[model samples]
Target: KLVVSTWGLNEDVLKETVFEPFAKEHGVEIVLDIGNNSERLTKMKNNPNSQIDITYLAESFAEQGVEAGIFDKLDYSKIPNASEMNEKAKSTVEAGYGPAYTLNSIGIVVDPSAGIEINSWEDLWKPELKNKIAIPDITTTNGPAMVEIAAEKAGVDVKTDNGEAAFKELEALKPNVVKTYSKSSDLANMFSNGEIVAAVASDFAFGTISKAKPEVINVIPESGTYLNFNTININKNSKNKDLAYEFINYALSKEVQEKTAKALNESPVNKEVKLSEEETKNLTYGPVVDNAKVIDFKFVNSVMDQWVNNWNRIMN
Candidate 1:
């Protein structure tokens, strides 16, 4: 039996393509646990010897786990697909493990019915849309990713005072929220229903919603948003080390990556997975050897708590 822990919808694809196929091939049963990365990490931490054999952690969370001595260094030699991945993937790789790709961006899905035009990031804050916007609670990775984008869009320097100033900009937009979601799925459904006309969030939330509700168009802020990556780590005591590698590498395969890419509506780290001319334009990773701007894990971590504290102080 194998246990795989992963995040929300992205992990749905992970299970359907990776774990399920691996289980069948090995004739082993697999257990999949899914939720926010933080939630998944806590589960692994408590059940250190529990069913979890592998996990998909975000970059900062991966570092936190390593710093806390929760994971084993990945045996990358076993993962051929990882070897073929780009540098942003290869190095500055999660401190605790190997990763696919994680990039954060603030996007808006505009409803033509709303009579709104959103070619730039600034249009999201307009008065007419007040109380009709949806956002993630900054307490999560999805939320903080937006804090940085919000600051950049507002021309506020995000790094100063751990984004204290950024919170002010966020607070100013409080009245605009149609809902504040902890789960991206809820927000996606809201956007799909047009219950909320626009939202700002991690690629997971924004990408999921836009793809589900094709009428909702996306705008990757010109200023660019924070980027994070998915991580692959090994269990320190696993007996099936080599098999784990096979499972990990299979996720990067063309059929799996393409299905995940199509289902999750995010980017694929696999270079060989080709997208059509229309699809190529939307992928997060393609053409680029590896993606860019994945900073040190600690740096990413240091910002989250601050984002949470500030969001709570300002919005709650």
Candidate 2:
């Protein structure tokens, strides 16, 4: 059995598209440790012989882990499919942390019923939008970047400095925002109920909007948004390192890439996987990602605590 640590929410689709197929092909039992990265990180540090052979981590976490010598450098000769991956999909290039298997974007979602149009992050503060905006709370993955994107619009660079000026600008957004949600579903529900006209969220909301509120649209702001990447890594102490690499290679296979992308509306890393026009519009494809800024994970990691404190002080 190859123990893989992954997010519980992604388990279903992955089971159908990646896990079961790979397992059947290799004739192996796949045990999925479905959870968040915090526990995975702790296990990597405390239990060097952790049961997790394969793991998916955010780009920053993977970078930190590789730097700390907790992960094995991927053998590209064994995982050659990486050569065909999108540039944004392979953040582990120089450091050999892990390869991104999937990609998404941080952007604006809006309800056309509100009779408003937003071309940039600065438009979130328009007076007419007051009490009609919904954004993820600071606790969510892409939340800080949403706040920082607005700050960047205000000439404050939170990714680099204290961003006091940015926080001050973020405060201006309070009146415009109806709520700061802890979950994407809640934000999506608000959009369905017409409680909010706009939101700062990820492309994962694409399905929600298309299914529940067909009138809504998710916009990748031309001024730029964050390109989110999820990378898969092998635990340094895993006894089944070879199997882990095999699984990684299979997950990146063209067949798996096309299926997963079509099934979940996730952007495929495999360059050969072609998506329909509608699917392309919902994804963070080459054109969309190229226009956006990549989040500086290292910088974010350094000031995370302060970011939380700053968010509470200003937005709360």
Candidate 3:
């Protein structure tokens, strides 16, 4: 059995589309475990040689994973479909680290019945929105970017480029904090309840929202928006590194990518996958990501501890 760990994409879509197809083609079955970056990261880091063979890691954690030597150098050349990726996508499947597998934007989520309007990140501070926000806990990748936006809006550096600024912003987002979750997927479920006013999150969270309610909004900020990417790597000691590459190649295939995109509502990193007219409407590729200010993953992950400290200080 090939064990693959993944994050965020709709579970049902993954089963019907990617996993089942690969299993059929390769004549080998797969054991799939799904969880967000924080969960998988701790598991892999704590147990050195845990059962996971290929993980669906979050954006920056890809870097952390590489630094920690949790993956094998992915063979991007083997994955022809990878050429379909966007220029904005830097972390390649060929990297000694891992390839960037997907892309999405960071924005706010607001439920319709909540009677809130979130056109941009700045709207979160409006008094009308008080006591209605439900956000991912500061532990995820999307949290810091929102914090950075809040500080930049105030013209005060939240303290450091290390993500302290972002953490401080999340702290003030207290009370009526409604729900605190570890996975970005939770933000979508909360919005479905129709009470959540707004919370900082990723465009990919729409994997749930697109199914739950069409009324939820992704508040894109004016200063600029952040693009998020997840990397893939091989496990050096894995009993099945070659199979790992085979799995990764199949996952990044055009049909597989299109199915994942339709389900998640995220922009594609895979260049060759053709989006329908409807899918194209939301495709955030080409010039869209061209203009995105790509925050350095190294800088953000390095200052992560200080970010935790800063959030604690403010929330306390």
Highest lDDT scorer: 2
List the global CA lDDT of all models.
Answer: 0.65, 0.78, 0.67
Backbone steric clashes in candidate 2, count: 0
Q: Between candidates 1 and 2, which one is better according to TM-score?
A: 2
lDDT, candidate 1, 1-316, per-residue tens: 7777776575556567567777898889887677887888777777747566777777667777777667777756666676555555666433437566433334565666677765555676778887788776765656656676566656766655566666767777777877767887887778666688877655456557767786666665554444556767766656666767777787766667776666665466666676665554455654232323344556647676666666777777
Give the lDDT of residue 12 in candidate 3.
78
Measured by TM-score, how close is model 2 to the native structure?
A: 0.88
Candidate 3 error regions (>4 Å): 7-13, 33-40, 46-52, 92-96, 109-136, 154-199, 204-217, 263-267, 277-288
- What CA root-mean-square deviation does each model show from the true structure? 4.5, 2.6, 4.7
The window of 10 residues in a row where model 2 has the poorest summed lDDT is 88-97
lDDT of 3 by residue, 1-316 (tens): 7887777467777677678778888888888777877787878877855877777776677778777777766666776666766766754543456667777776566665666666766676666876687665557666666556657656676444545454555555565466656675676666666657577666666546657778776656665677877666666667887788887777667777777778765566777777777775554555556666565666667777876677656654
Best by TM-score: 2
Error of 3 at 130 (Å): 6.3
Question: Whose TM-score is higher: candidate 1's or candidate 3's?
Answer: 1
Model 2 Cα lDDT, one tens digit per residue, 26-67: 999999887677777766777756788988887767767776
